[PDB]
Design an enzyme around this catalytic site. Structure first.
Site, mmCIF file in Angstrom:
data_model
loop_
_atom_site.group_PDB
_atom_site.id
_atom_site.type_symbol
_atom_site.label_atom_id
_atom_site.label_comp_id
_atom_site.label_asym_id
_atom_site.label_seq_id
_atom_site.Cartn_x
_atom_site.Cartn_y
_atom_site.Cartn_z
ATOM 1 N N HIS A 1 0.823 -1.204 0.000
ATOM 2 C CA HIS A 1 0.000 0.000 0.000
ATOM 3 C C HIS A 1 0.862 1.260 0.000
ATOM 4 O O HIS A 1 1.780 1.390 0.802
ATOM 5 C CB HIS A 1 -0.915 -0.054 1.239
ATOM 6 C CG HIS A 1 -1.581 1.241 1.594
ATOM 7 N ND1 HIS A 1 -2.348 1.962 0.704
ATOM 8 C CD2 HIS A 1 -1.663 1.898 2.777
ATOM 9 C CE1 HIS A 1 -2.874 3.004 1.323
ATOM 10 N NE2 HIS A 1 -2.476 2.988 2.582
ATOM 11 N N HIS B 1 -5.110 -0.492 -13.794
ATOM 12 C CA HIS B 1 -5.224 -0.291 -12.352
ATOM 13 C C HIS B 1 -6.145 -1.332 -11.725
ATOM 14 O O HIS B 1 -7.109 -1.776 -12.347
ATOM 15 C CB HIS B 1 -5.740 1.126 -12.080
ATOM 16 C CG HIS B 1 -5.551 1.580 -10.666
ATOM 17 N ND1 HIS B 1 -6.466 1.320 -9.670
ATOM 18 C CD2 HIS B 1 -4.548 2.279 -10.084
ATOM 19 C CE1 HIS B 1 -6.036 1.840 -8.534
ATOM 20 N NE2 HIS B 1 -4.874 2.427 -8.757
ATOM 21 N N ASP C 1 0.060 6.532 -10.740
ATOM 22 C CA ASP C 1 1.337 5.988 -10.283
ATOM 23 C C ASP C 1 2.371 5.942 -11.404
ATOM 24 O O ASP C 1 3.576 5.893 -11.149
ATOM 25 C CB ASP C 1 1.116 4.588 -9.721
ATOM 26 C CG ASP C 1 0.015 4.554 -8.681
ATOM 27 O OD1 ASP C 1 -0.848 3.657 -8.756
ATOM 28 O OD2 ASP C 1 0.015 5.426 -7.786
#
Lengths: 374, 374
Positions: free
Chosen positions: A217, A256, A310
């Site tokens: 995470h 994702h 990201d």
């Protein structure tokens, strides 16, 4: 048995609406794209703590309140001198928050107002702690905050020793807004789990940092930067992509787990990153990233596999002067606002001690065998 | 929505069987009464980490391994000199564990074997950290551990500056065994929630300490001591009880939320406390406690409301030299074994990232209103 608590809803919230299938992310009902483009970390933080956008006067006072709280106490700055410089930056942050709590004369006060005020203190100070860690890692001295700069601009100033350009400040500001909140992810949940025994805010936030430090995470952009390092140079990027696709191997940052189509956070960041690159120059990392984006896109775009936030954030932080080990700390610099907002909300709407259990599959009536008989 | 995760089972475990209705508590199938009376904190810790009782040679080596790890690094002892002496002891512990992690060259290693070895280090060191805090609170210097003493005896030695009698050592040893493990309570759950992102052991344990610090968990005996302080003297105890019962007001430490009949942990502790009182003398606190036990018992025993372990433990720790603010820290000195055992088990049997959620009750499509229009 609900493995991993998957599908389990344990409380109610008004903070974050996430529709991964349709690419929607709202902070108190407002689309993230709007906030990232038009807001500021200060204004978005106000939204996350108060549940609504601030009026002009409220925002001015709120931003000033945070600015005045950026500076860390001399006691803590002194302690930082001996914190192992070789240690993981998240461990540095974990310890800093914990030690800082020890300096609070009313550390254990958890009235709503106390949580809010202590929360503002942590939100303002997180950037200072992380910047200090970076400076120390470079063998330099932490830099006193400049209250005239925005939270984002000052973060860059304290981290790099130079005032950023408006373009760089806007890029970091957007990055912080984009990562400030994301529902009940692991660190937000851990914060609530800890707070459920009515422990103090520092304890709950230290638990959140502990959770966020885990690789599962808050470390997504690390894999993308590792990919970029693997590629090495822009000249080998295009060919590298072809080989990866030919082997049916995944391209980091593409697609994702939650956002099945577009990651609503990616667009604004990509645009602001471009503006910074055009003014300050295209770094080796940026060049490689864009080639991967284009070449991989030729095949992935038609399949609906698009670059997520990201894919861009790691290069953004690198371009702004940060190393890979500081990516998660930056994530925390933003997420602290969401954590505080969640603690305030949980207290207001639920406030129950969490009491989950486990299915017992062990033994019963096992004898305490005399030592010699074993 | 499963409020407070009540009734939710998220994983499987073989560690702790709890039957509150019937007064049963087992550690890997063995009744707690047997362990508290015949075991040692070292042996019970071995049981909690390995899933079985150790053979003679294994126990000798295990106890020696822990003993060698009791001493804290000079770096940390130096840092303790500036830790605010006025701070909450649990905040001191929280910070100590976090800072200690920074000194571990392989802090982030989470292989089963690494977690076990780092776990042994924390189990051995917890008592040293807490004892050091106590000494500093008294304006004294922390005391180097004596490897020839048991974990429990050495804890008392480091905390008080004098080697305890066999009776006192046995009392503390039993107290630690009795509180070493208790299923998926808040701190154990928080430890797992944090560890679920595969963060390091120090992070997970720091989160556990953060959770345990809250008043809703691990502070039961504090209320009993506060009752004793309210009573003030033994001479007013009997009359105080009568007034409380007449007003239908609850007597602290009587009855239990989980153990509807007998708290399986209370019996052994009460007996060992008596033996210490008979040899070292009956303290004012002990005298008051026994009068409350007897007078309140006349009415509560027939109703099936019996004194639980929390009714005795506070007085036990006070009689052994500790103040009320050190009660939860002592709880942690014992529980660290259960926490480590739980992390090892979760990794072995489940190891899933926890992903709970919340029912969204907020707004949608809220406009980003221009600053001036608010």
């Amino acid at each position: 048995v609900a493995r991993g608590l998957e599908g389990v809803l344990f409380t109610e919230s008004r903070m974050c609406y996430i529709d991964g299938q349709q690419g929607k992310l709202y902070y108190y009902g407002i689309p993230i794209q709007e906030l990232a483009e038009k807001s500021s970390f200060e204004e978005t933080t106000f939204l996350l703590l108060h549940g609504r956008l601030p009026r002009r006067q409220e925002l001015e006072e709120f931003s000033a309140a945070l600015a005045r709280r950026r500076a860390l106490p001399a006691h803590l700055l002194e302690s930082f001198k001996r914190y192992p410089v070789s240690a993981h930056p998240m461990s540095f942050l974990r310890t800093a928050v914990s030690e800082f709590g020890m300096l609070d004369p009313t550390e254990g006060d958890i009235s709503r107002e106390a949580l809010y005020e202590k929360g503002l203190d942590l939100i303002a100070k997180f950037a200072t702690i992380v910047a200090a860690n970076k400076r120390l890692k470079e063998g330099k001295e932490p830099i006193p905050p400049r209250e005239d700069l925005s939270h984002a601009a000052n973060f860059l100033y304290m981290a790099n020793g130079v005032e950023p350009s408006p373009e760089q400040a806007r890029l970091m500001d957007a990055a912080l807004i984009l990562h400030a909140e994301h529902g009940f992810n692991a660190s937000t949940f851990t914060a609530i789990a800890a707070f459920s025994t009515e422990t103090d805010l520092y304890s709950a936030i230290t638990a959140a940092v502990a959770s966020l430090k885990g690789p599962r995470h808050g470390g997504a952009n690390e894999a993308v930067m590792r990919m970029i390092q693997e590629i090495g140079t822009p000249e080998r990027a295009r060919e590298w992509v072809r080989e990866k696709l030919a082997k049916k191997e995944r391209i980091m940052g593409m697609g994702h787990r939650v956002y099945k189509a577009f990651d609503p956070r990616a667009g604004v960041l990509e645009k602001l990153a471009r503006l910074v690159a055009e003014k300050h120059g295209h770094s080796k990392e940026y060049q490689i990233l864009k080639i991967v984006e284009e070449e991989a896109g030729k095949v992935l775009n038609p399949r609906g596999i698009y670059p997520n936030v990201d894919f861009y954030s790691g290069v953004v932080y690198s371009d702004l002067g940060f190393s890979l080990e500081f990516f998660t700390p930056i994530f925390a610099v933003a997420r602290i606002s969401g954590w505080v907002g969640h603690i305030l909300e949980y207290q207001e709407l639920d406030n129950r001690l969490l009491r989950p259990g486990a299915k017992y599959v062990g033994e019963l009536d096992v004898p305490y065998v005399p030592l010699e008989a074993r």
